[PDB]
Ligand binder design. Sequence first.
Ligand SMILES: [Zn+2]
Ligand SMILES: [Zn+2]
Ligand SMILES: [Zn+2]
Ligand SMILES: [Zn+2]
Lengths: 302, 744
Amino acid sequence: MFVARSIAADHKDLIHDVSFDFHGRRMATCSSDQSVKVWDKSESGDWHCTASWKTHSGSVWRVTWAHPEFGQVLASCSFDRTAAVWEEIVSHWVKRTTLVDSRTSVTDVKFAPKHMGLMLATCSADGIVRIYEAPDVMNLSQWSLQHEISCKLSCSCISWNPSSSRAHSPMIAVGSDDSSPNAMAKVQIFEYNENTRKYAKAETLMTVTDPVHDIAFAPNLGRSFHILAIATKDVRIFTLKPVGPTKFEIHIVAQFDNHNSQVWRVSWNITGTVLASSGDDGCVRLWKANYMDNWKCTGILK
Amino acid sequence: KPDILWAPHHVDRFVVCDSELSLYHVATLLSINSDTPYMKCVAWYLNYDPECLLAVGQANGRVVLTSLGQDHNSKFKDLIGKEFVPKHARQCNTLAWNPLDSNWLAAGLDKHRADFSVLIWDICSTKPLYELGQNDACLSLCWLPRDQKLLLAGMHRNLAIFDLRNTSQKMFVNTKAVQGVTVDPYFHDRVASFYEGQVAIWDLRKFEKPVLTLTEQPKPLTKVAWCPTRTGLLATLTRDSNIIRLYDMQHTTIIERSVQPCDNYIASFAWHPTSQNRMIVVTPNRTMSDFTVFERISLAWSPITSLMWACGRHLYECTEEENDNSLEKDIATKMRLRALSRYGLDTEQVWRNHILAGNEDPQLKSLWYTLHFMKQYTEDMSLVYAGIKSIVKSSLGMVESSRHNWSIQNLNEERILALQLCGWIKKGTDVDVGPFLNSLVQEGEWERAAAVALFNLDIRRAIQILNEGASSELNLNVVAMALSGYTDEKNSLWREMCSTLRLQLNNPYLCVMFAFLTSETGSYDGVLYENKVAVRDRVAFACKFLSDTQLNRYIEKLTNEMKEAGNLEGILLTGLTKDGVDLMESYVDRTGDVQTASYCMLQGSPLDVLKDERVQYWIENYRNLLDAWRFWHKRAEFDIHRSKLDPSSKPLAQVFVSCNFCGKSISYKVTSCPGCRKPLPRCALCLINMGTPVDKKLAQFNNWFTWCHNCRHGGHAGHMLSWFRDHAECPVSACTCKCMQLDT
Ligand SMILES: [Zn+2]
Ligand SMILES: [Zn+2]
Ligand SMILES: [Zn+2]
Ligand SMILES: [Zn+2]
C-alpha cells in the first residue's frame, strides 16, 4: 500500500547514506565528493540545505545521528582510518575528537542506546571492534576506548539492541563479508557480564555460510524476545528467546528470495513491524506480517 | 563471436551483429545486411559521414567497408564499397580507427610469412599507409585518443607502446594477458588485459607489472568494457552467464557487483555510449534487452511512518497509503490516529472507546465491554478485577438435569455474579433476561437471540423470534420450522437428521443450537468448544448448566488456550492479575499495541500488578513513542491520568532553588524566606524581591521565578518575557551572554 514520490533536492556526486535524527526533521547525507551536508525540513514540508563541509582524506560510507538529549552530534567513518564527531555551534560545525586508533578502514560506526550514556562502536577490516566513551557530557573533546573485541574475521556491519528493559544486558552483533571457500559463521553476538565486567561471546548463527552485508535489530517495544534481520543472498529474520552468557533459543521465522540478487541494506521501523530491504535488482521491497503470523511482502518500489 | 553496437552519432540507431548484419532503431529494424557472410572483424567509421557506414574484416583480412544508411549525396563513396586486401593472406584478428584523425585507420591480421601484419591504411575518399611488426601476431589493434601519433599494440606475448612519427620508436612491456586492452577516456593512465576467466589491470605510467589483478572466474571472460557515462566503472562479460560481473575503479578495495539483464545466456552485452549507464544485452535467440544497472541503495525510516531512500543522486520518499480503507495501515499509523482522537482518556462511560478506536475490531470489543462491566458493578458494589477463574474458584451448589424441561435465581449467587459479568443478567436481581433479549432483537441479531432463548428454555418464544426476524429482510423460517423435531428418542428421524446436519450449517449460532438439541445427555462438549462462536456466550452457558467439577476443567483449559493464543477476549477469564499480565504480554508480542496495554492495566489495578517490571515498560515505551510523535500535550494528559491512577509512579526530578543564608529549600512574609527569614532574591528589572504565596487567583504566572541556566540571573516571568521580546542581552548590567537564544 506504499506509494512513492520525489524529494526536491539537488546533489552533484553520488551519496552513500541518509539518516534522520530522532524526530524526522534533520537528515545527513554523505556524498562521493567527501562532502557531507545536512538538510532541515521546514514547517511547509520543504527541504532546505543548512550546511556542508569536506571530510578527511578517505571516502565516507556512514553518517549517523545522536539522541537530542545529548546535544546534536554525528559520527562518520571513512577510509582515512578515523572516526569523527561534529557539534552545532549557533551554524558552523566543529571537529571535537577524531577517534583515530585503527590500522584499517573503519567500515561502520553506530551509537549506543540512550539509557547507558554516550558510547559509539566501530570496527575496521582488521577485525577488531572498539567501544568508546564520553564520561562527561559537558566536553566532547575527551573519549576512552575501554573494550577491544577480537573477531577472527572481518567486519561488514554492526547493530546494538534498542531494548532498554533492565533484564537485558547490553548486546552487539558483528557481521562479516569474507567469501573464503571455507564455511564458518559470519554473524556473531556478544553480551556483557557485569560480574566479569567484560564482553563475552554469547551465540553465533551457524546457518550463516555466505558473506553478510548488513545486520539490524528490531526495536523491542515491550516484547519478550528479540528480532534480528540479516542481509545475505536472501533476507532472513531470526528471533532469539532468552532462556556467563545467557543461553538463547534460536529459530528462523522467514527466508526471502524475492530479489534474485544480493541484499545490501536492511532497516526497521520505530515500532519494529515493517522491514525495508534494498538489493542489486534495483528495487526496494517492504515486508510486513499478516494475521497468520506470516512474513510476506507489502510493496515493491523502484 | 557476435556482438552489438549503436550508431556513434544516433543514440536511437542500434546495430545487431550476427551472421547477417542488422540495423535497428530504438526494436524496429532499419535494414538487413546479409552481404557479408562469415564475419570475422568489424569496425566503424570515426567520421560521421557516411551515416550507418562500417568497416569489416573477414577471414581473408581485406580492408572492406560496408554501409546501411540511405545517403542521397554521400560525400565519400569511392571508399564506400571499397576493398583493400593485404600483401598476404592472414586471418582477421582485430580492427580499429583513430577518432583524432579519421583518415588513418589501423587493422590487425593473423600470421603470414614475412608480410605486413599491423598494417594501417587510409581509405582515401592499394597498400597500408603505416606498417610495422612483420611476421607476428597482433591480437589487438588500437589508437590512442589523446596523442594522435600514439597507439598501443598487443603481440603474441607482449604489448608495445609505439608511435606513428617514428616506426622504430616503441615501448614494449611483457605480460601474460593482452586481450581486451583499452583505456577509458576519463582514465588516461589505466590499461586493461584479459586472460580467460582472469583479468589483468595495469597502469600506463607503471606499465611493467599488473597494477590490479582480478579473480579468475571459471567461464572465460568474453567481453570487457568501460562505463561510457560513469566514473571508475568497468564491466566484464563471460560465456553463458545470465549476470555479468563488474568492478569499481573509483577507489584510487574494489566493489564487485553483477547484474543480469536477462534470464537467458547472452552472447554479448554492449552499453550505449550516448545513454547514461544504460547497457544492452544480446542473446543468440535474437532477443535484445536494455538493462541499466543501478548502484547501491540506502534507506532511512522516519517517525511518521515514512521511508526515505536514496537511489543514486536523487532523493525519494514513500508515504502511508492514505486510502482510509484496507487494514488501516501499520500499527504506528493507527496508534497516532488514536492518540490524536484522545483514545482511552475518555473515562466517564467506558465502552465508548470501541468507537473512539476507529474501525470495528472484535478484539477491541471484548476488552472495553468487559472493562465497562467491571467498573459499573464495583461502583454499585478483588471483587470484579479477579476474572471468572477466581470468581468461581470456590463454586458450590450446582445441580445437573438429565433432560431439559423444554419450555435462573435457583443458582448460587456467586455463580450468578459470573452471569452478571457475562452481560446476560442485568444489574438487578431479576432472573429475566428479557431486556437482554429485547435489545438483541432490536439489534437485528436474530440468531444470537434464538441461541440465548434456547439456552433460556423458551422454544416457542425462540420460534416466534425466528419468525419475526425472517419476516424482515427465507432460510431462517426454514430452519425455525424444521427445529420442532426435538425429543428424547433413541433413533429419531429428528435426532439422526440433526446429528448429520449439525456440521452442514453455515451460521455458527444455528450450528450451536443444533448441537445443543442433538447433544447427548451429560456430555455438552460440542457447544463449549466452538471457536467460531463467542467466548462470552460459551462461558455463560457453561456457568448456567455445568456442575462444580465440570467447570474447573473447562475454565482452566479455556484460559490456558486463550493465554497461549493471545486472544484479548479472554481478559474476562484472566482478570487483572498476573495471568492477565501474561495474556497482555502475548497480545503485545503479537500485535504490537501499547495503548491497549497501558490503558487497560491502569484501569483499576491493585498495587501488585502495577509493580511488575513488565507493566511499567509498556507505559514508559508508549510515553517515548508519544515523544517521537511530538505530541507533548497528549503525553501531559496521559501523565495526569497515570499519576492519578498509579501511586507508585514518581514524577520527574527537576531543580529547586536554595537560599544563600539558610541554605535550605524554599518550596512548601511572602517576600521573606521561611527558613530563617532572610531576604529572597529580586528581579533584575523590578528590583523588588521575589516571592509567591505558598476562582480567586492566588499566585499568577507572571510572579513565578525564571532564571538563565548559564548566568543564574533571574526575575519575574512577565518582566523577563517583556524584556527579551524587544532586547536580547542579559538584563543585569555588565552581564554578557544572550540568554534567550541559547535554547530557542
Ligand atoms: Zn534560606
Ligand atoms: Zn546574568
Ligand atoms: Zn520582575
Ligand atoms: Zn544568561
